[PDB]
Subunit: 488 residues, 4 copies
Amino acid sequence: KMESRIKDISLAEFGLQDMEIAKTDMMGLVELQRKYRDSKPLKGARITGSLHLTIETSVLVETLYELGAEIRWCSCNIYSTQDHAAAALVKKNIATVFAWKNETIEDYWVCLNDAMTWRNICGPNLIVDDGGDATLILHEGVKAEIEYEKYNKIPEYLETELDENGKQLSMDLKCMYKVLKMELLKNPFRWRGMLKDLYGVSEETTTGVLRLKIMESEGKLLLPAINVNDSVTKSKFDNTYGCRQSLLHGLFNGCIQMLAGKKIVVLGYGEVGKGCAQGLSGVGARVIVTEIDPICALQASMEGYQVSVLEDVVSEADIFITATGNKDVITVEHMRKMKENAYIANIGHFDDEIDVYGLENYPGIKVIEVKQNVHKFTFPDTQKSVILLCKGRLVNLGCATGHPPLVMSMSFTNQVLAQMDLWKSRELVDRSKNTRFFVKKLSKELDEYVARLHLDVLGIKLTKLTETQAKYINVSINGPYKSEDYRY
Amino acid sequence: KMESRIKDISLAEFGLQDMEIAKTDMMGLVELQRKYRDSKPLKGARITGSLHLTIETSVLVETLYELGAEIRWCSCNIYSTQDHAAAALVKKNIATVFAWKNETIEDYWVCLNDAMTWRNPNDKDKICGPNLIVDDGGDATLILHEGVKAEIEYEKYNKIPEYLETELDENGKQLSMDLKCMYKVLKMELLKNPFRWRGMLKDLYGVSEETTTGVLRLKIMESEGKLLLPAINVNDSVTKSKFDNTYGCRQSLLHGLFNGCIQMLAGKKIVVLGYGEVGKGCAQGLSGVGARVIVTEIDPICALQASMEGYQVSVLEDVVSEADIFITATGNKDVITVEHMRKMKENAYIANIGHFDDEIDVYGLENYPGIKVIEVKQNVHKFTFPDTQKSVILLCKGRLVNLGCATGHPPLVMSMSFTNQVLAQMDLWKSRELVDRSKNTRFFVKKLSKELDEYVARLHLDVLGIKLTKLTETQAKYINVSINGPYKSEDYRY
Amino acid sequence: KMESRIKDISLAEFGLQDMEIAKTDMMGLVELQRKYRDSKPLKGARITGSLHLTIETSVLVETLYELGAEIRWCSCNIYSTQDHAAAALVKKNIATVFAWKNETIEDYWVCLNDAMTWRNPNDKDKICGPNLIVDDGGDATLILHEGVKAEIEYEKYNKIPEYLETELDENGKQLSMDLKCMYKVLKMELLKNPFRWRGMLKDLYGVSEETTTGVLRLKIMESEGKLLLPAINVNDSVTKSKFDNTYGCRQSLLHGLFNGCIQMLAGKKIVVLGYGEVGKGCAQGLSGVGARVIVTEIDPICALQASMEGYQVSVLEDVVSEADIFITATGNKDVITVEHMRKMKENAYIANIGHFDDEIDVYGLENYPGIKVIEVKQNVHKFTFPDTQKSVILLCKGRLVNLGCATGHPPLVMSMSFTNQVLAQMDLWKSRELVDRSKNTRFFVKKLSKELDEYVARLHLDVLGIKLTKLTETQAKYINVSINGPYKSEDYRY
Amino acid sequence: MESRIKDISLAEFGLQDMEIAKTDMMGLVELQRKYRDSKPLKGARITGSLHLTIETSVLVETLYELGAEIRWCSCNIYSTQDHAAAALVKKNIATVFAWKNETIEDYWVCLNDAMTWRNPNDKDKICGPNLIVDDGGDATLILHEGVKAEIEYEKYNKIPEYLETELDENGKQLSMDLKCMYKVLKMELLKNPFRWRGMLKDLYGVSEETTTGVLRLKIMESEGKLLLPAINVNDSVTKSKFDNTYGCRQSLLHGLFNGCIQMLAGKKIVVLGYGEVGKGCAQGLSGVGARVIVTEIDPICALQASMEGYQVSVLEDVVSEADIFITATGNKDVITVEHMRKMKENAYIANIGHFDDEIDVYGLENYPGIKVIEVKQNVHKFTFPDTQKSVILLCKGRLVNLGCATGHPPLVMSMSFTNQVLAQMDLWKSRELVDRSKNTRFFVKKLSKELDEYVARLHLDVLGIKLTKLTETQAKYINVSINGPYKSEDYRY
Ligand SMILES: NC(=O)c1ccc[n+]([C@@H]2O[C@H](COP(=O)([O-])OP(=O)(O)OC[C@H]3O[C@@H](n4cnc5c(N)ncnc54)[C@H](O)[C@@H]3O)[C@@H](O)[C@H]2O)c1
Ligand SMILES: Nc1ncnc2c1ncn2[C@@H]1O[C@H](CO)[C@@H](O)[C@H]1O
Ligand SMILES: [Cl-]
Ligand SMILES: [Cl-]
Ligand SMILES: [Cl-]
Ligand SMILES: [Cl-]
Ligand SMILES: [Cl-]
Ligand SMILES: [Cl-]
Ligand SMILES: [Cl-]
Ligand SMILES: [Cl-]
Ligand SMILES: [Cl-]
Ligand SMILES: [Cl-]
Ligand SMILES: [Cl-]
Ligand SMILES: [Cl-]
């Protein structure tokens, strides 16, 4: 496909308006445009992006374009796209987009595959990823081509509708496999052909980084990678403060009830859980925390929160928010013990945290649409119901518009810097000898730079060290100011 | 009009779903239905309501209906109606509704007038008014009193009064759109029947007023001896002012800002003008998500309260150029002027949470010479001045942002406010016989008792799993109160 | 007793230093001194005070002195006196003081009686009483009323009444130490002069009551027609109840706990019994340092307020075995019983912040069969039950922890409370002539006006750099108030 | 030989507080229960330089129950709790040299005494400790400076001139701490010029408790001057994220409430430094209604403060209007005399960073014609002669939480001290690998994440925390062991 696939081009005007307003606070991206718009450090680069296509993301895409790159983009979640944002990008020819709000799981993988396809067929030079789906289709595509040549037929794991243990494959796996199968019939050298020109990936979130580290250990990582999620100016701000506002927005839109005085269980008290808890407390809720890490559990106590095992609180709590990045944290057996009209939502990257499949396929269960992406499930034996927000997917992006511009600018300034780093290192990626790669992070020098670029947004005034002071604490006047192990 | 005027009847199904979910937390109204649905304490009563037609309001209307009343309803703001809620009411024949989201100011007054019009049960042909009124902001009460004034002035000179035909006030300034459109309706009614409004007085037994601003208008009429019917101040029940006004807004304001303002609130300087019941709640919510609240206030006691909560207290002039967002919660007039807005910084957001659009000089802004306006989104406008080229974003034309850009307060707290409403309506209706107009031309404003105020609270304890302690005989005697209450003096401030 | 009784006069220098520092924030008292030191509105008045003798109280006493009054003072609690503050007053001859930290209950009543005793200015040999009383808790008011009762009963049978000699109450139970020691003083005074107390009535013009508990005792006397002098309820001024009671305790409780309890508050389950003016503040402070507050309450309205602030509301029975710390703020009796304390866990801390030691059954605990007690530190005792071998730590024998283990509320907020006191004393004194005892005559309890309540707040705005906004003529008219106030209705709850 | 303390009769009150404190110090209670029989530290001589509080008494008791002989001194002239010191000497747990309100001269004599041990083989001779528990780096400093002084003594065969002078290399007066330390080093060169180097033979390591002391250790490591192995206890997650932050949240307030008579609500309080400590200080101050203004040099920390609703300014722009100033930088000359002269009447100034350098106290006390008066125990009001304005300083610019109050509470100190005991056990168990016949560089290391999580587990029951346990599938999905560790080494919590 050389032209874009979006919902409505006429929404472009509203998108450009929001983009300009958003830029007031996205000073990091505005500075990169101002500074590098003439020198074009990314000239000639082909960038494919798999990341929530929001207004904030449009400014990221615009920044990459102003720096000389050609762009192809898709969203990393079926409900997160903002149609007016997508329209703005195609209206100005900044990028070729394959994204719309409320995609089917089938269309999600077709869009991702389209975004990965470039014309003279070849692939991208760089990848901006959030969740690891773009990275996954690449690696699984290479595996599928190896297995295809070995037996000279379509591999049986792609045609079966079951996994290795007899259980149904997830819809995401079936739809991806379906795309990989269609591509083996067109060209069985497609994916391995892309490797010649791939110079790296920037990964945005915790869950995607986990998938990258697993590949690194096993020696299966096929391109350089930069962990953007673990920059201080991303994990300590986006993950925490972003969700503090973003979760509330999502709950206010999907849940009609008052949060004050309710017992709200936050499962997981990591970077995201901490923020969720702050916001919920901020509007009068009584947060109960669930956690497996004894250090994180103690942190929750120190902030005045009760720490319990879900089993002891499931019958009495009013709302459940999963923020673990784990699997089967809320089971169907848990949901049956919940009380009438208990709300369930997820803010971790995938829909595995809540057993949504088990709930939808429960024998004789009744489901009704309460509103746009909010469903009420009623069990036949007890006659009790539970309300699920946007089928267990990211509520902050599914029921609302995700994090606001200021924090996304910090996350995206890191992305641009990561893309520039990977591109500037092209020459060192020699595949005639080195087919195996590692995950690295951006330096603390750049991490502090990202923070400096956003100080004027909030009228912050930094103090400057004197020569003597700098020497006393043993740091340079211009930084960095802390050790690599410092936790902020 | 004997049939309803709404946006879309097919949205009724979604409305009934939200109503059932909302009822999980609205235990006060659910209890009143359970208790009085058989005895019908309001049987035969004709109730007209002028109050934001939200899902929460649908449950209020349903409660009044289950208690035997016939209902006619309209919204008290052009942007607050939830079309699916309105559809649910007409779908089940609970009430006759005249309301839709995004009404014109002209249609607002026509809807209110329609809601006030009833067909005479004796002679299905003639016109009469309601027996009771549920009001929020005082507009239903205003059209009644101004209608009576207009009829007095009509008979005196035997012609349409000149104050209704002019488009200017007593000083040469343009009348507000709300006054022109109301006057236009009063004029049309003088041509149909010049005894319409005074005719309604025979059967009017009272009004329940929901908000601070409407109560102010009632107290002014009481002092001047111009109040034409009994009134109950629902806003000053402890279970309304200390919960709805404060905790309702804590959530409700944030919802409105999140929907209308795309920016992050954390670290921003947000000015909350007015630190009363509403301002206090607004400040709590804003702080809750990391904002730096600056407070403006005229009351030295309220100003000190703000300091004790860690907030800076300043005059708007000293903070207008640096602050990022402005929230008016004063119940006053011209708190944000055009001269203030010109000194604001690029893309500063302005919003109002007090009952009317007077707090911000919206008329002055829209009519500023050579100003450019553009719609950022549904009910959000960006105004750009021609000389400085700087812009300000206004949320829903300076009207209630919590109801204009969002869905207002959540069910739990509205159930507390509405349980008071039902009790007020039952009180006014039960006192009918004492309202003798052949002699008593003087009416007053009263409040519900503390006994009932505590009752409202008891009805909602199970929603949040609250467990009350019960006094022993000795304890009750020691603190000099009954085991069953009331537990505090009338002057207690909670 | 011409001369004072205090612990150590050499501590006077430190007291005068703290007084000057405290005055930086006590702008209300500093303004009254500046304004009235020349005109002496209280010249010739004899004032007896029964109120915690802290540095803050020294500035109150100094203010009354600069306004022309002669002063005699005692503390209203055996642990609250700050010896350096008492020394400062006697060093400068501002007042005659009878107070020291760690008084015995016996000495407490002797000090109060001494403070009530004055030398007749006409005939130096004879005795008389005060003209005005500054009271906190109602003990000065109590000894007066019980003294009059004792004299009536003395003349009736011409002998010492038997209720004063017995060590038991009407049901066989031991009298409280406070009753025994007061009775012992009243008995001595009947032997010196059986017309002493009734003689004081001739010149008594009123009492200013500082706290909730004392006001309750005044209202009971008012109903029964037993109140023998005019009274002003200072506690219910907005600038007292909404600041002192709430914000004072937010800091003051923490100070007390940090000094008496060695443990960390963060993450602990702390039960606050009573969520009134004081409880609300206690909860804010505790949350502020990471505690998990659980609330007990009998009032459904107050219970709901606690929920809205994110606190769990439970009955003590359901949380007594698991909670770590217990804080009583009810103004009630037997809220923590010995049966409750036996179910508590090892080294659970128990403290009280309500005015008297009745909230916790301290007598029952100290007299429990075979119980072992040990002093952990200055005014902190650990009690160990013999059967379970478990222990509970009690802070300063169940008396005011904020004043017993720490120094009470800080200057800023006490200045607001004490500015009301001075204004109350001036009011009572200026009304002398209207107090005619040759006639019926029932006395009542009244409050200060809102005009004065706002005045108190204005006097403290500069302390925190608060900038008030001023209403325009139009704005004042729109909201129907004077530009200079008052700004709210009498029923407004702030 | 025998201890030096204020009053032995206060011992009974100390033992009472120790037992109460142990209810929450479950980490130390568990170590005692577990290792009291096997005595993993048997035969070890431990010298400690750390605030002698009730909490510290439980640490000392734990080390004793594990078989060590102990000598102890405080690491600050105002932090000692006399009843705690008395308790240790009453039960013969340790030999103590500490009392509240020491003179700077006596502080260094106490530290030197604590470092002195009687040779077990030949009772006549002197030796040093095997292990050192340090907080601030003073025990580590006297050792290194003592070795330097002995090298310079033999070279020139005379007392080095830098020890006799009362001035530094630029003509400025030496700090009292340097003069008094030098005075002790000089006296020891006259008794025995091989004393300090003699201790090196048996030194197996030091556990450093605080940020500032770690900085001093890292400087020595870079320069190749570190003379013994070291463990950075301060950077364990169960120390920096709890003690530094949550400890101060309560501890600062306690100090201010005791030293400052004023109400904190509504006041503009400047917290200089928004690091681990600053964050906690700000939380507590906000908790009681103050309006916190933050000062910071780090753009990342500055942004963190904004996100919590705090204004971030340079001191110059807020010094005339702010009411209270709290230094938490670990830096030098953050509050100067020129700053204090611009402050308003009765502005309060306090420090919570480890040393008194953050505030120019020397400059203030020695200002021409200044008047000083004692407001109370360790609180002084200084009045400038030209403007007539005054500033109140809390405990001469030293740790206000420990100077005006009792420091952090037991729960968090148990977490910090459980790390200490584990560090001491680690250093002692590695003795054999410390071979000085080969002159190797010594480095600073940290405890493992396995142990860091262990410390947290030991304190879960104190607050009734209930941990969830991962299933086999879950553990595999997130790629961790069911028993941990649960996070990567770079994770910031
Ligand atoms: N009182 C206590 O009980 C206690 C407890 C723990 C640590 N400490 C001490 O507190 C100090 C700080 O500890 P930490 O762990 O927070 O250190 P940290 O590095 O975490 O924080 C120090 C902060 O100060 C900032 N800073 C440095 N110089 C500055 C200047 N001139 N102006 C503004 N900001 C400046 C740094 O950027 C940093 O954010 C250390 O001296 C440490 O020993 C004391
Ligand atoms: N408004 C937004 N636009 C784009 N990405 C977002 C937004 N809000 C959150 N995210 C990203 O989505 C990721 C989770 O999929 C987060 O780690 C975050 O970086
Ligand atoms: Cl619990
Ligand atoms: Cl490093
Ligand atoms: Cl229509
Ligand atoms: Cl200011
Ligand atoms: Cl002009
Ligand atoms: Cl005597
Ligand atoms: Cl005057
Ligand atoms: Cl519960
Ligand atoms: Cl054992
Ligand atoms: Cl030499
Ligand atoms: Cl030299
Ligand atoms: Cl500012």
